[PDB]
Design an enzyme around this catalytic site. Structure first.
Site, PDB file in Angstrom:
ATOM      1  CB  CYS A  32      26.012  14.906   3.609  1.00 29.85           C
ATOM      2  SG  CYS A  32      24.328  15.537   3.904  1.00 29.85           S
ATOM      3  N   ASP A  34      23.676  15.239   7.865  1.00 31.41           N
ATOM      4  CA  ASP A  34      22.615  16.182   8.216  1.00 31.41           C
ATOM      5  C   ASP A  34      21.495  15.579   9.082  1.00 31.41           C
ATOM      6  CB  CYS A  57      23.596  22.254   2.861  1.00 28.88           C
ATOM      7  SG  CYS A  57      22.363  21.471   1.780  1.00 28.88           S
ATOM      8  CB  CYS A 101      18.725  18.600   0.701  1.00 32.45           C
ATOM      9  SG  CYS A 101      20.517  18.566   0.359  1.00 32.45           S
TER      10      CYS A 101
HETATM   11  S1  FES Z   1      23.881  18.285   1.424  1.00 34.14           S
HETATM   12 FE1  FES Z   1      24.265  17.881   3.572  1.00 34.14          FE
HETATM   13  S2  FES Z   1      22.316  18.810   3.959  1.00 34.14           S
HETATM   14 FE2  FES Z   1      22.032  19.437   1.854  1.00 34.14          FE
END
Ligand code: FES
Ligand SMILES: Cc1ncc(COP(=O)(O)O)c(C=O)c1O
Ligand SMILES: Cc1ncc(COP(=O)(O)O)c(C=O)c1O
Ligand code: FES
Lengths: 138, 377, 379, 138
Positions: A32, A34, A57, A101
């Site tokens: 994702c 991050d 997120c 996360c």
């Molecule tokens: S889902 Fe991409 S950071 Fe929580």
């Protein structure tokens, strides 16, 4: 998201950085995108200063806030026991899919312990704390 | 400060006043051979002439569905399956809602040849592409009238001309009705999707408009309502609601579209005073109610949640906000980098939006960007 | 005197009170990640649990649909295509609703072998047929809980015993819910169709219940709502109303049903006093709300419209009423001839019927029959 | 349906049998299974009296009622002009699909006339007015 996730989202604990210093772990997630950076300082093996910088997120910002504030005042031994599941349970659960996360807040606290070691020259503690995989990654 | 109108809309008080007698006093079934059925029958056709009128559809039929999703499913699969002997080739836009794309993919599995129609930077479909890769075994083209994600209005009236009737033209007009002119005559629609909630009718109902003497096979099978095309006892209250809404959209759309654009620009020309902000989608040929901007260094869900905390409801194409953790396909087709798609913010304006809302939006947002940036590498 | 509850019901005011806030005040989309979205999810889930609890459905999942028709479509087509690899043979009862029969007929073009289970004279499903026709490749049996047309309650528990985990059991319960006990555990359902408006909820919503481990493919495709099984922004207000109705039905149903059973019996014992009247469907194993009679020498649409000039809404199975000019397949399945399905009259009872309504039906009917009879070449 | 259909069905005209019947016409619809018979008494080449007995829906009753009402007291020449479309118009139209029910009444009236002719040797008149086809059909 639990009322605890919210609290730590609006009021995140320990946002920032400590310049050219002890442990600093950077990890990103292949799935994702991050990105997270964790900042720490120690007593001899007992964390007295900690801050975070995160890209992701609400869940992600909340894991670092809770992960950081769980690792304040605790020894190196104690905060190696702050896992994906521990941050998660403290935050009063997360939806499947937000679990990664927690891993990110776990492995960024993992890697900034793998720094106060790689930067202080302690390669016996890395192969003896079963944490061999991460020094062989940064 | 609800700026999420494309996700959901309230039902207008006046639509609601018109539905209730059918829920509680005139609750009969249009198939019934008595007064309760007879009353339900008149209620349904009035509604039906009214939805029809709303898109200039006298030259066709309205088929009532459970929503725009189902209606899209019926135009892609109902049409493809009925008309297969003529050919097995279909073009679909790459920025179509998933209720078009996913039935298109299903078709592939059943051996249709589907090619997807590329768009440019602002998400406008490539018309030349349509023109070149149009074959003689092509039976169907599906191209949205406008895009709910980035507002961009599509060149359908021209697209119609490049087909000349060598293929059926399906147009999803979920985004468009109430917003900009939707005459099926001007655009040469052969099938047109309409959504009741997107024009402040009730949720739960929607329509397909079908040009006379185009032919479809049903997807929902049963007792034979809507002349075989959609079985199930008719949801008379929601249909009579859709009827009123159409009626009110026809009186008021131009006035409120105007108010809406005036609001949209103000948001646009201010929001872009923020360091590192880019507008997504076409800047001028754009839906009145639509603002889609991205912000560098930060992430979408984070922005939306910080706004909600200030009492502001909005949207994002961020991967992190998605249950499959996939970013918006609309934005990948446009050619945005995965990393670029992270910081998108979507504001959808609607009927109840007002000056003070925008005032408040512009006063709380800047704090959200700066503060979220304070944390980001 | 509304005696047509099989075709449409009013919404209970209590259901209407729970719905309205979601239509104007709390209109958010369940997938929106903000407060309005979060209130929306919470109400949808509350509802989902209330519909599960109504049927004792904790051993599986609730999928919301646009009604019983779509849920029947999803259960038949959706189950069959998904489990095709374990066989392509299906049994479907001969009296099923057309929303099961027609999906059945579609699968007959897609390479499935469907056999339709005959019924006896009372419309009861033949259990020995199922037992004999069952094969290593039977993947699905669909049999209604009860018939809405002739009121007959089907032998589902037995069926479940016979199938004994060799094939999926699909149960259409549109007719039974709120009338008699509906417990997916007691009856061994793998899939169960529920209808909102049949329990005085709003029209335009429904549910298929699916036991854990049953796999289906979806019929409505789009954004993956309902975990992928049924796409489309959620009709939050209908779902909430569905939910309020389920709650009401669970607490009120046994009382409601004893009251309908008495009204029904009172109707039957007087209606059978007309020369040449016969009851269709089972006399005892019969829904509390269902009276279905025929009268020789006259036509069904004409009985129904005479009653309607007096102020009485009812229903018929007569070919003359159809629009395709075909009598009821339920009636033909029982072995009634076309002659005798002509004079059928169906009264279905419901929540707002009074003893005053019955008085009215009992004072108007004999004269309607006599009037029509005096004009019949047949009499 | 329509206001006249409803009035005729509810207050149908000329209902009954006739023992006397100078002519009798009976038809059945193959599709829906409706049956009808019309009785006439003819005096001076005119329908002095007429009755019907019909088994069918609301339309078939309304059509029977109108047809007989339109026939009463007319010369045979006049009564033969009462086609299905004249019954349908005089009622305000019918749903397409109810259209065969006006048919039923039209036929039954034509047959009672052919019947009056056939019982009274006026067989040239069957030829003269074309009803050989309708007469053959019995
Ligand atoms: S889902 Fe991409 S950071 Fe929580
Ligand atoms: C352009 C467009 N078409 C169709 C749909 C599907 O709408 P619904 O979810 O109400 O079926 C949407 C999303 O709302 C949409 O944005
Ligand atoms: C047993 C049964 N199943 C399914 C249906 C279809 O329900 P709906 O028309 O509301 O979709 C009906 C109709 O009332 C029914 O009686
Ligand atoms: S008499 Fe059978 S349809 Fe009119």
């Amino acid at each position: 998201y639990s009322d605890k996730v919210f609290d730590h989202f609006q009021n995140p604990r320990n946002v920032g950085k400590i310049e050219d210093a002890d442990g600093v772990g950077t990890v990103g997630n292949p799935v994702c995108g991050d990105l997270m950076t964790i900042y720490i300082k120690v007593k001899d093996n007992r964390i007295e200063d900690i801050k975070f910088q995160t890209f992701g997120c609400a869940a992600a910002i909340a894991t670092s806030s809770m992960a950081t504030e769980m690792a304040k005042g605790k020894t190196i031994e104690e905060a190696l026991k702050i896992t994906r599941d521990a941050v998660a349970e403290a935050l009063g659960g997360l939806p499947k899919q937000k679990m990664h996360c927690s891993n990110l807040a776990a492995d960024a606290l993992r890697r900034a312990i793998v720094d106060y070691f790689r930067k202080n020259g302690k390669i016996d503690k890395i192969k003896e704390l079963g944490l061999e995989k991460e020094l062989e990654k940064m | 400060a609800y700026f999420d109108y494309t996700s959901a809309k309230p039902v207008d008080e006046r639509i609601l006043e018109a539905m209730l007698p059918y829920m509680t006093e005139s609750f009969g079934n249009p198939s019934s051979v008595h007064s309760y059925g007879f009353k339900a029958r008149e209620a349904v056709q009035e509604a039906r002439e009214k939805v029809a009128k709303l898109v200039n559809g006298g030259g066709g039929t309205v088929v009532f569905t459970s929503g725009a999703t189902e209606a899209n499913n019926l135009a892609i699969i109902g049409y493809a399956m009925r008309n297969a002997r003529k050919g097995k080739h279909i073009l679909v836009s790459a920025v179509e809602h998933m209720s078009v794309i996913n039935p298109a993919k299903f078709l592939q599995k059943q051996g249709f040849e589907v090619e997807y129609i590329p768009v440019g930077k602002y998400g406008e479909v490539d018309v030349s592409f349509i023109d070149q890769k149009l074959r003689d075994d092509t039976i169907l083209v599906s191209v949205q009238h406008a895009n709910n994600e980035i507002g961009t209005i599509q060149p359908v009236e021209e697209i119609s001309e490049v087909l000349a009737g060598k293929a059926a033209l399906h147009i999803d007009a979920t985004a468009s009705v109430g917003q900009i002119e939707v005459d099926v005559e001007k655009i040469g629609a052969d099938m047109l999707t309409i959504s009741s909630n997107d024009i402040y009718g009730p949720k739960g109902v929607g329509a397909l408009w079908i040009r006379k003497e185009a032919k479809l096979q049903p997807v929902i099978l049963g007792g034979g309502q809507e002349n075989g095309l959609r079985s199930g006892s008719e949801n008379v209250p929601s249909i009579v609601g859709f009827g009123k809404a159409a009626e009110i959209t026809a009186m008021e759309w131009r006035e409120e579209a105007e108010r809406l654009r005036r609001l949209r620009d103000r948001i646009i020309d201010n929001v872009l005073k923020i360091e590192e902000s880019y507008l997504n989608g076409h800047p001028e040929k754009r839906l009145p109610n639509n603002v889609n901007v991205r912000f560098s260094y930060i992430e979408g869900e984070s922005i939306v949640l910080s706004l909600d905390m200030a009492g502001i409801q909005a949207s994002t194409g961020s991967a992190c906000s998605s249950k499959t953790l996939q970013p918006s396909h609309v934005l990948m087709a446009c050619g945005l980098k995965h990393e670029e798609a992270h910081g998108t913010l979507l504001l959808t304006l609607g009927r109840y939006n007002t000056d003070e809302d925008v005032d408040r939006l512009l006063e709380v947002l800047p704090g959200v960007i700066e503060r979220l940036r304070s944390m980001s590498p």
